[PDB]
Design a protein around this ligand. Structure first.
Ligand SMILES: *[C@@H]1O[C@H](CO[C@@H]2O[C@@H](C)[C@@H](O)[C@@H](O)[C@@H]2O)[C@@H](O[C@@H]2O[C@H](CO)[C@@H](O[C@@H]3O[C@H](CO[C@H]4O[C@H](CO)[C@@H](O)[C@H](O)[C@@H]4O)[C@@H](O)[C@H](O[C@H]4O[C@H](CO)[C@@H](O)[C@H](O)[C@@H]4O)[C@@H]3O)[C@H](O)[C@H]2NC(C)=O)[C@H](O)[C@H]1NC(C)=O
Ligand SMILES: *[C@@H]1O[C@H](CO)[C@@H](O[C@@H]2O[C@H](CO)[C@@H](O)[C@H](O)[C@H]2NC(C)=O)[C@H](O)[C@H]1NC(C)=O
Ligand SMILES: *[C@@H]1O[C@H](CO)[C@@H](O[C@@H]2O[C@H](CO)[C@@H](O)[C@H](O)[C@H]2NC(C)=O)[C@H](O)[C@H]1NC(C)=O
Ligand SMILES: *[C@@H]1O[C@H](CO)[C@@H](O)[C@H](O)[C@H]1NC(C)=O
Ligand SMILES: N[C@@H](Cc1ccc(O)cc1O)C(=O)O
Ligand SMILES: [Zn+2]
Ligand SMILES: [Zn+2]
Ligand SMILES: [Zn+2]
Ligand SMILES: [Zn+2]
Length: 447
């Protein structure tokens, strides 16, 4: 989750993650591109405000007041610069001066030409096989991060797409208990609470940027899946897109799709929750997908209706107390899918984003594994298009987004876990076209 440069004994010892940009005069002489004016090494801001109660709750979780368990100094960039060392630009800008506005367009995957479709799944496949040039992922919790001999950082290289999967797993994993310790309350830094929409927003942005980097195609954009069709099939589960059903195993992907070759990460909950370890970069086993195949829950075998999208955009409050999966008249809880499309919570309703996950009846539905099915990307670009439309209709009314007593990870000014450099929910609560340099090509149901 940290730059390779910072995953060292010395940098953890200093508490400082401020890598050089262009260290012409030797190591440490252009931290954060300070010698060119691009940024400065400064103290991290981290939300201190209180969260909703948990019984029991030790507070030993390395995700509290993120990222303070590891670093308390990052790069703060000036102007429209950013990046872990301020070597790149804020979203929406390009150039060595970061002064050319760029605007990329995210579109319906089904609206793409045959050429762009092939470019997408090949780009996706590439990002699955290519080492992240920048981030490395911890395989051990903080108290063991430096190894048995105390001089060996427990960090692994990981692929671009697997990093996208890893960050999501880390945000939802259970707090370790240990030996003799009671069952700690279950927590979720990226779902069941207001930060769900902004966490996943940044999640996508980080993948888009990493893939534009990988391809050296600055305008590359992630497309989206309109799952609000009422359909009983998955209309992008074809061999020229996300993969059709295997004729040999009806829960596998057709061997004629590259995605049948993908192998998953983070599928060892039993190992982690007992050995005390974290998901690592070693893959094991294929994607399972079985659209409309959940015969035990008939509600989970059709997709959301088109009016479900239009109706949830009528919920005027962004979120409501207790800012959880049981909130009512909360647009966040509606689009996430624990309340019905009108606003009304019911513990039996599964709608919209949650409905779309369960529909797949496979790897795409398990909360710790779901990004391993690449349909995740396009399910979430769609979800984010709904978020972006809400932000527009209601001028980004951030007021009902709680500053405190939200579930842990979800306070308005929390640094979304485990993204780097630190980045608060507030920074994602903006219309995308003007403030984040992307927009959606989408028409909304007009009822
Ligand atoms: C920002 O981070 C700085 C770096 O700290 C690391 O990174 C952060 C993010 C965390 O991961 C942190 O745990 C990492 O260590 C941080 O500076 C560091 O602050 C710590 C905590 O105070 C310092 O450790 C303490 O040092 C004192 C005094 O130094 C003694 O040096 C020798 C060595 O033994 C002694 O013989 C002398 O008596 C010196 O006086 C120790 O008294 C103290 O030990 C006691 O406390 C610890 C827990 O803190 C217990 O385990 C012990 O048993 C003792 O009860 C600490 O070890 C550390 O030196 C310091 N490092 C540097 C490089 O400055 C900084 O404070 C953070 N800034 C902010 C604003 O929060
Ligand atoms: C996919 O759906 C199937 C069938 O709808 C699920 O397996 C059933 O789960 C129920 C409830 O837990 C069990 O009592 C049944 O024994 C299971 N049926 C069969 C035929 O095995 C399955 O868990 C779903 N998988 C995912 C990943 O969503
Ligand atoms: C939503 O779920 C929360 C969290 O479980 C519920 O809060 C509980 O409330 C009861 C009585 O009000 C307390 O005894 C529990 O200790 C609470 N749990 C926690 C974790 O704090 C709440 O009841 C639900 N809210 C609604 C509106 O139904
Ligand atoms: C990680 O990758 C970089 C380049 O991508 C390489 O220089 C380095 O040796 C790799 N690190 C490890 C720990 O294998
Ligand atoms: N766990 C949610 C749905 C869900 C949400 C997020 C996810 O990654 C996977 C999921 O399956 C439910 O059953 O209502
Ligand atoms: Zn706490
Ligand atoms: Zn600054
Ligand atoms: Zn998620
Ligand atoms: Zn999701």
């Amino acid at each position: 989750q940290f730059p390779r440069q910072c995953a060292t004994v010395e940098a953890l010892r200093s508490g400082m993650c401020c890598p050089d940009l262009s260290p012409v005069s030797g190591p440490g002489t252009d931290r954060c591109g300070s010698s060119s004016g691009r940024g400065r090494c400064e103290a991290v801001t981290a939300d201190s405000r209180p969260h909703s109660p948990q019984y029991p709750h030790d507070g030993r979780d390395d995700r509290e007041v993120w990222p303070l368990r590891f670093f308390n100094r990052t790069c703060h960039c000036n102007g429209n610069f950013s990046g872990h060392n301020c070597g790149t630009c804020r979203p929406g800008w390009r150039g060595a001066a970061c002064d050319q506005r760029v605007l990329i367009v995210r579109r319906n995957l089904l609206d793409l030409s045959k050429e762009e479709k092939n470019h997408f799944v090949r780009a996706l496949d590439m990002a699955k096989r290519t080492t992240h040039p920048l981030f490395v992922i911890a395989t051990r919790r903080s108290e063991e991060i430096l190894g048995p001999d105390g001089n060996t950082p427990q960090f692994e290289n990981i692929s671009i797409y697997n990093y996208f999967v890893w960050t999501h797993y880390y945000s939802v994993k259970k707090t370790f208990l240990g030996v003799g310790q009671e069952s700690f309350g279950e927590v979720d830094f990226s779902h069941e609470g207001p930060a769900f929409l902004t966490w996943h927003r940044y999640h996508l942005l980080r993948l888009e940027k990493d893939m534009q980097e990988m391809l050296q195609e600055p305008s590359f954009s992630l497309p989206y899946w309109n799952f609000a069709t009422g359909k009983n099939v998955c209309d992008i589960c074809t061999d020229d897109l996300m993969g059709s059903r295997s004729n040999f195993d009806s829960t596998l992907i057709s061997p004629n799709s590259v995605f049948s070759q993908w192998r998953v990460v983070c599928d060892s909950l039993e190992d982690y929750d007992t050995l005390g370890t974290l998901c690592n970069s070693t893959e094991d086993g294929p994607i399972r997908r079985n659209p409309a195949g959940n015969v035990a829950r008939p509600m989970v075998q059709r997709l959301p209706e088109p009016q479900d999208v239009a109706q949830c955009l009528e919920v005027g409050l962004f979120d409501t107390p207790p800012f959880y999966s049981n909130s009512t008249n909360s647009f966040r809880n509606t689009v996430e899918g624990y309340s019905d499309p009108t606003g009304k919570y019911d513990p039996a309703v599964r709608s919209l984003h949650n409905l779309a996950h369960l529909f797949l009846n496979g790897t795409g539905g398990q909360t710790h594994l779901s990004p391993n099915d690449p349909i995740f990307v396009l399910l979430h670009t769609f979800t984010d298009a709904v978020f972006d439309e809400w932000l527009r209709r209601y001028n980004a009314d951030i007021s009902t987004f709680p500053l405190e007593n939200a579930p842990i990870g979800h306070n308005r000014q929390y640094n979304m876990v485990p993204f780097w450099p630190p980045v608060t929910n507030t920074e994602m609560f903006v219309t995308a076209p003007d403030n984040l340099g992307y927009t959606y090509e989408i028409q909304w149901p007009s009822r």
